Structure formats: C-alpha cells, structure tokens
Write a protein that binds this ligand. Structure first.
Ligand SMILES: [Mg+2]
Ligand SMILES: [Mg+2]
Ligand SMILES: [Mg+2]
Ligand SMILES: [Zn+2]
Lengths: 563, 38, 131, 141
RNA sequence: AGCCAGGAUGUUGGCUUAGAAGCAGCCAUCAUUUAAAGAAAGCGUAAUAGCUCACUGGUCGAGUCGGCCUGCGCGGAAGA
C-alpha cells in the first residue's frame, strides 16, 4: 500500500520481503509510473494494465495495451511467475519445458495450490488513499486465498488423544463444532462472543457443550457483524464468522460444540504481559467498581491480567504496552465510568544477616508473686547463605541446658514463625534466620507458651539491633533477544542502571542477553527497550534469588516512620 | 556557539583562527568547542 | 633520538655486526598482522640470533658515509623499511631463509632480501658446488 | 580464512570450557555455541592449568570449522601453581604478591617453550620471569 | 610539515578474583618478541574488526621547533 508516497519502489519492497521475512515472493501486479503518477497496475496473467480513473473514487477503470515503457521487465517477471507456478506438479513443468504457454486457469490453480501449502506468497500492489489497487487485491483474494473446504480438516483430541480423533469436513450435516476466538464487551448484555463455525450448524436458542470445561451454554442471539453494528440472523452455517450474545462464562479460545465433538482444539497458547503498572482511583473507595471493571476487562482479554498482591493494597495491571495499559484506563473512564490514575508499584524487600553471630537472650520479670510463671530462652542467630533453601527458616534442635518439658520440644519452631513470617523491620519479611536453642529456664507446672514466645521475641529484637543487618532488594533474571547491531546499546542501558550481566551468548537469528536487575528500578523497561531497539526486542522475568544492593531508599522506608 | 571573552583550546583538535580579527576556536571533532572572541 | 652523533655512531654499530657476521635483512611497512607477523619476527629473532639489531638507521647518506668503507653496495639507498637479522654460524643461514620466505607471506614484504655478500658478484646463493 | 577475527578477552582462563556465565554478557558479538565449545579445547585443557589461570585464544576460522595451533601452557599458570601464593597486583605493595623463584622459571622454561615462544626459548623464559617478578613481590632466591 | 605503514600470540593480567577485555574500575606491570608494546589516547573504552596514544623506517630538499623579556597593536568595549 502507499505506492503513492515518495520513495516508493515495488522491487525494493519485494527484495526486502525475500531477504528479511524468508519467503520467496512472486510478483502478481506491477506498478505503472512513479509515486505521484500512479495510474494503476498491470497484471502478469491477463497482460492488461488496469489504469484507474481519477475523477470518480476508483469505482471505474480503463484497460489499456501495457505500453513499451515497461515491456521487458514485465515480460521477465511474467516468465518468472510462470516458472514459479509450474513448481506445483510435474505436469506443469513438463509442458512448460515443452515450449508451449500454459493456460491461465492452470496457472491460477497451481498458484492457489502453492499458496495453500504456503511455499510462496503472491504480492499485489496498489494505494487505498489514491483509490487504486483494492479491487485487484480483492480479486486476488477470490482467485488465490483458500476457502474453508479448500484445505484438509482441522484436528483435535478425544479422550486424551487418538490416532485420528477428529477430521471434520466443513459441511452442513456433521455435528456442530466451533471456536470462540474473540470476547467483546457490551454494556447492555454484559458479553459478546465471536465464534467461527468450523464444521456444523447451530441456531438461535440451541444449547451447546463447552467441551473443555464440560458445561452447558445456550446461544441466545447469534448475530452477524458490520463493525460495531449488529444484524440479527436466525442461523449460522459452517465456515461463517458470527457473534454470540448470551454467553456468560466462555473464555477466549474455548471450543463450543454439541456433545460427542472434539474436546480440545489447538488454540491453547497466549502471550505474556511485559509492562506491569499499578492503578488507584482518586476517590479510594471506588475500589469495588474498579475491581469489577478490571475483572471484566481481564476475562475478555487473556493478555491483560489483574492480580492484587496481598502484601499491599495496590491493584497490579499487566499489559503489552504503555499504550495498551492507558487505553485500558481511559476506556474505563469513558465506559463503565471510573476515574483512575496510574503509578508505580511498591517494594517487596527482605532481609539477610550481614554475617553476624552471637548467643543473645531475652528475659522479663513475669513472676511478681501472683502471676505464677516466667520464661527465658537462650538463642543463637546465624544466616546460612543467600539462596540455598526455599524454606528460609532453619532450625536444628539442640536444647541441652534446662531441657523444657517433652510434650512441646519440637513445637518451639512454629512460635518463631510469627516473627519471621512478616514485619520485623519496616513491615518486610525476613529470610535465612537460623535459631539454635541451648539454655533457658522454666518450671514444669504449666510453662505458658504464649508468654514464653515473648522472651524469644525480645531475644530476636536484641539480636537484630546488635546485628546491624542490611536490607535485601528483589533482583530478577531478565533475558532479552535482539539483532546483533543493538547489543551495545542494550548492554549500555543495563550498565547505566545498577544491573549485573551474565551471558555472552549469540543465537543464529540474534543474541540472548541475560542480566540481573533490581525491581524498584527498570519500571517501564520494555517501552524504553523498544525505543532503543526499534521495537524489536522482548524480555522475561524468572524471579531469581535476591541480591544485596547499596540503597538510600532501604533506610528511608523505615526512617519515614522514625524509630 | 560561545562568545566568552576568554577562548582556549579545550581539546587537542581545537585550532585558533583569526577571521575578521576576532580570535576564534574551531574544532573539527566536536562542535561544542566553537568559540567566538579572544 | 636520531641525532647527529647517535646516527654517526649507530651507522658503524650496525655495519660492524653485518661485517663480522652474515648478511642482514630488511622488512617493509605495508601490512603487518597482530600475531601472524609479530610471531614471525619472533621466530626470526629466535633462529637468527639474540644479537641482531632489528632497528633501522639506514639513511642513504649515513650508509654511504659509515657502511661504505667495506662492501660499498650497502651504500645504495634502502628505499623501504628495514628489520635486520644477522646469522652466527655461516653465510646464508636460517635468517636468510626466513627473509626469503617472508617476502611472500608472514610479513608485509622483505624487499627481495638482497643481503650483503663479500664477493658482491654472485647473484646465486652459496651453493656453487653441484655435488 | 582470517585467524580468530573476533578478539575479545572475555573468557575465564582454563578451568571449564567456554565459561560465559561468569564472563558477563558484554562481548556477545562472537558466535560461539555448544559446537565449538567442546571440540578441541575440551580434549587439550589438561596439561596447561590444573586449577590455575591459562587464557586461551579461540582462533575462530571462517572455513566453517575451528582448529589451529593453540597456545602452549601459560606462564601465568606456571608461576601460579609452582608458587603456592596466587596473589599479585592490587595488594602488591602491602603483602605477598605471589612467589617467584628460579624453580618456577625453570619449570615454565621447560614447559611453555612449545608455542608461547619469542625471540628465544630463553626469551620466553624471561617472559615467564617478568610475568612472575613484576607482580610486585618475588621470593628471594 | 606533507605521503607508503607498522603497538603481543606468557597478557578474561600475576588482575578488588562474576574478567570488567593486548587500550572500564584498578594495582602498576619494557610484558624477549623492538621501522613498536603504554597493560593507557578518541572510536565499543565493558568489547573485536577497520582508522589508531606514543614512537619511528621509506619518501623529501632548507630551514624548523617551542619557550622568556620588551615596543606598538587586537578582543573584552552596550544608552538613550
Ligand atoms: Mg588590546
Ligand atoms: Mg576595543
Ligand atoms: Mg554587546
Ligand atoms: Zn575542541
């Protein structure tokens, strides 16, 4: 398209297609003239130049005699078209090498065959803005693109798979099968399910089985579509794309069919969101309405997910881009109206001891005569190492001096959990603490456990202050691919940030870079990456082990509340 | 450019030229070393 | 530091080693490689000897003044870069072989490796006896 | 055709072949994979450095294979395994920068005189002597 | 001054050891290997390739290079 725009060259675009994408392309319609004097196109089969008329809006055109300005390159590419079409069967090539010109019908059929097996792509030229080329591309859609029964049938699995479970020829007689490719939002009914009937017939009011989830759905209003507009139709035949009102539970990519039809279809894969944002409405108490809006927009779109992380109150918004994610917020402002501003996510820190070990203890004068008991514990805090266990709590029982009563000796580890689980420093959990009980004191009458847990807590507190332990940031394993020309820029950007690097690896179609970066930094990293790489890079997060980092924010989150 | 009253050669590729009497610094490496008047 | 006294001295200090030992070499400055040429001049210093003065102060006038006392063909201008590798045990030794083998590979060019011959009339190498 | 062609000093000296993970992702230009990482180096990484530093030249070839006359056993490893103290510069004016004696020099001379040679076998011995002595501290012998 | 070009293959340095790269931090380390090797010049400095700190050989025919003092000038120097 845009053959009218300056710099236009059909040949260069064809060569770019061959060199970059990988397909070998056969020209179908060349172009007469330069960008401004784009009269029309010349087909390489009928040998006619369909110059379009400027006065009317492309509806009419006039056929000419393909002038001598391009009568040699045209013949050359026409011959290349013949030769390329002849690579469909030996009967074509044998007559082609026999010196006789093949008839147009067999050329078109052989091309349709080559498009069907996807060996070649047929390239047509034209400019929609200049009202030219569109009729010829639609014509080549009729002549070359495949109809539903112009390929073999779709396959599936039945009862955990079979040799040939389903080969459903698209017909009006076989039992109903379909796929719900798209879900849309209607404020007046609450859903809009787009489906393509691969093989079968279904009608208004007919019940269906959602094979994957094994449940019943009634088709209330099957309709056909003209963009936003909807037109009621009584029935949908096989091979037709329609929208189903009255579906309330079907996720994108779920097969909808009558019973005894293929349970699972191939449409089982979706991408992973790269951009993660937080959002919070101006009035904080619109949270239920916002949550409902997010839940609907997440059920319709499988690549947009909303999970409310339970460490904080923030709602986490994941998406494919900053555009994507802000269209998902102004759309909320306009339909299902809520006003919400996006921001940054908060910080999930942890802690590790800075290689300090002692034998600290705690003691409260709980006796006072009347109370009747008291508790004391001698503990020994130590770290193990940053990242050897999944269970950070390590406890090797060793109680020797003052051995406590024998019914809850191993039960003096779960009581320590309520300090390690959350919040000792600034409301952030701790990892790797090891306790090792050697001494203490008690009296074997009724040694109160809940007030013995106070001694352990004050012991942990004292150990913390004398330890001078430091904060641990979250750092993940990003992996990026890019062409071997932007390696310098990507590695420079990670180096500008406080990012480590790991792997000098080069693929065959690029390079896989591996880097360890913080989580408080690199907010909106994907969009910056696309900017500095010409939108040709992806990444992933593997949530690897935390690493130490010099942070001026690590203490600012606890000196905000002081002591 | 720079119209500072004290032009100097900030790097090695700067040259001192005296076009129109005015003493100028012209740098054939990076244009941030272009000054006007001695 | 190619001053007048240092040149007048090093001219004789480099003519002496080639008038007491074997012929010397010369290697131009066209295209040297990082290891292909550096380790070739390494092997040259290895086989030829550890006393060769691979430096070059072979100006035409300095040569005609200093070196031309004996074997006056050296006085002829050496219009190329020069790396001198003499040879201890006889004439036309491993150094001459390395120079002749460097004129076509493993160096820029060896300026045909003409060398110094006491007779100065034998174009052929010192293999006169057919045997 | 062209020897090596990519000269990047981003490879852990000896030890595990192709130790990219420690070396860092900043020299990704080179096209090394699991094919050229265990062809020749895997079978001749024994008599050079058994627990010591021996940098290796890849010598990648444009002939669609990888093989060349690889470098002989390093002197960096000779003077780090015959010494005991593997220290050096950085803390060379404060404590031991490693040991260097005539025994390590003779070892490297009789060992690294295959391919890592210079203007003499004794000249590569002086190379090992410089690589052992100029660390900042040398044993007295 | 102008032109024909050459600086490691013990050397991810023996290295702040996850190298920070024959020219990041860095310690110092001619490191024979020399028309050259400084473990540091702008390119990628985190790195190759191809121009190259520095340095010289070959060309090429009379002056050249920087400082110090002094005279007289130049810019700094825009108002009703
Ligand atoms: Mg003045
Ligand atoms: Mg003035
Ligand atoms: Mg003014
Ligand atoms: Zn400048």
């Amino acid at each position: 398209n845009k053959m009218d725009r300056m710099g236009a060259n059909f040949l260069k675009v064809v060569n770019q297609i061959k060199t970059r994408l990988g397909a070998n392309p056969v020209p179908l319609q060349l172009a007469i003239g330069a960008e401004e004097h784009f009269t029309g196109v010349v087909d390489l089969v009928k040998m006619k130049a369909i110059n379009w008329n400027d006065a009317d809006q492309g509806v009419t055109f006039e056929y000419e005699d393909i002038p001598a300005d391009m009568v040699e390159l045209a013949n050359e590419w026409h011959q290349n078209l013949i030769e390329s079409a002849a690579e469909a069967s030996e009967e074509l090539m044998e007559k082609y090498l026999g010196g006789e010109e093949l008839t147009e019908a067999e050329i078109k059929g052989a091309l349709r065959q080559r498009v069907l097996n996807n060996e070649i792509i047929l390239v047509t030229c034209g400019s929609a803005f200049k009202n030219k080329g569109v009729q010829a591309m639609l014509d080549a859609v009729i002549d070359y693109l495949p109809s539903p029964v112009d390929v073999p049938a779709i396959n599936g699995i039945l009862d955990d798979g079979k040799d040939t479970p389903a080969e459903r020829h698209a017909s009006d007689d076989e039992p109903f099968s379909a796929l719900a490719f798209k879900i849309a939002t209607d404020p007046f009914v609450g859903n809009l399910t787009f489906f393509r009937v691969y093989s079968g017939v279904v009608n208004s009011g007919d019940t269906v089985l959602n094979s994957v989830k094994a449940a019943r759905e009634r088709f209330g209003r099957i309709v056909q579509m003209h963009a936003n507009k909807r037109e009621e139709i009584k029935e949908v035949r096989a091979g037709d794309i329609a929208a189903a009102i009255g579906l309330k539970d079907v996720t994108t990519g779920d097969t909808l069919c009558d019973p005894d039809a293929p349970i699972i279809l191939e449409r089982m894969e979706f991408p992973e969101p790269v951009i993660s944002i937080a959002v919070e409405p101006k009035t904080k108490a619109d949270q239920e309405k916002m949550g409902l809006a997010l839940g609907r927009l997440a059920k319709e779109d499988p690549s947009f997910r909303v999970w409310t992380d339970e460490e904080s109150n923030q709602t986490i918004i994941a998406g494919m881009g900053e555009l994507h994610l802000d269209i998902i917020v102004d759309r909320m402002k306009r339909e299902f109206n809520v006003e919400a501003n996006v921001g940054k996510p908060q910080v999930a820190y942890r802690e590790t001891i800075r290689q300090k070990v002692t034998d600290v203890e705690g003691k409260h004068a709980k006796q006072s005569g009347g109370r009747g008991q008291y508790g004391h514990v001698v503990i020994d805090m130590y770290p193990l190492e940053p990242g050897s266990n999944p269970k950070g709590y390590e406890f090797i029982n060793d109680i020797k001096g003052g051995v406590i009563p024998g019914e809850y000796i191993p039960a003096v580890d779960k009581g320590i959990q309520e300090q390690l689980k959350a919040g000792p420093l600034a409301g952030y959990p701790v990892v790797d603490m090891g306790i090792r009980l050697h001494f203490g004191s008690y009296h074997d009458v009724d040694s109160s456990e809940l007030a013995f847990k106070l001694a352990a807590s004050i012991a942990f507190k004292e150990g913390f202050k004398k330890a001078k332990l430091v904060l641990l940031e979250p750092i993940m394993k990003v992996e990026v691919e890019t062409p071997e020309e932007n390696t310098g820029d990507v590695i420079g950007d990670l180096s500008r940030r406080r990012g480590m690097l790991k792997g000098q690896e080069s693929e065959v179609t690029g390079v896989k870079i591996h880097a360890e970066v913080p989580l408080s930094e690199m907010f909106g990293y994907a969009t910056q990456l696309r900017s500095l790489t010409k939108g040709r890079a992806s990444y992933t997060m593997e949530f690897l082990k935390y690493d130490e980092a010099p942070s001026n924010v690590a203490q600012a989150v606890i000196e905000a509340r002081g002591k | 450019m720079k119209v500072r009253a004290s032009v100097k050669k900030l790097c090695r590729n700067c040259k001192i030229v005296k076009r129109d009497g005015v003493i100028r610094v012209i740098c054939s490496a990076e244009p941030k070393h272009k000054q006007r008047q001695g | 530091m190619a001053l007048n006294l240092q040149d007048k001295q090093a001219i004789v200090a480099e003519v002496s080693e080639v008038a007491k030992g074997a012929l010397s070499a010369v290697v131009a400055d066209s295209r040297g490689v990082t290891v292909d040429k550096m380790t070739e001049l390494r092997k040259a210093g290895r086989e030829a000897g550890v006393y060769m003065r691979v430096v070059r102060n072979t100006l035409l006038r300095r040569a005609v003044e200093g070196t031309p006392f004996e074997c006056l063909k050296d006085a002829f201008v050496g219009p190329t870069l020069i790396a001198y590798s003499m040879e201890h045990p006889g004439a036309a030794a491993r150094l001459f072989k390395e120079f002749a083998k460097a004129n076509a590979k493993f160096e820029v060019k060896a300026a045909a490796f003409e060398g110094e011959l006491i007779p100065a009339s034998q174009i052929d190498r010192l293999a006169t006896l057919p045997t | 055709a062209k020897k090596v062609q990519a000269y990047v000093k981003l490879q852990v000296a000896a030890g595990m072949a192709n130790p990219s993970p420690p070396v860092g992702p900043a020299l990704g230009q080179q096209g090394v994979n699991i094919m050229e990482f265990c062809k020749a180096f895997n079978a001749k990484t024994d008599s050079i450095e058994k627990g010591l530093p021996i940098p290796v030249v890849i010598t990648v070839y444009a002939d669609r294979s990888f093989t060349f006359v690889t470098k002989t056993p390093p002197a960096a490893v000779l003077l780090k395994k015959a010494a005991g103290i593997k220290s050096g510069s950085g803390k060379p004016n404060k404590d031991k920068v490693g040991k260097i004696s005539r025994a390590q020099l003779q070892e490297i001379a009789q060992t690294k005189a295959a391919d890592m040679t210079g203007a003499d076998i004794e000249a590569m011995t002086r190379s090992i002597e410089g690589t052992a002595r100029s660390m900042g501290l040398v044993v007295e012998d």
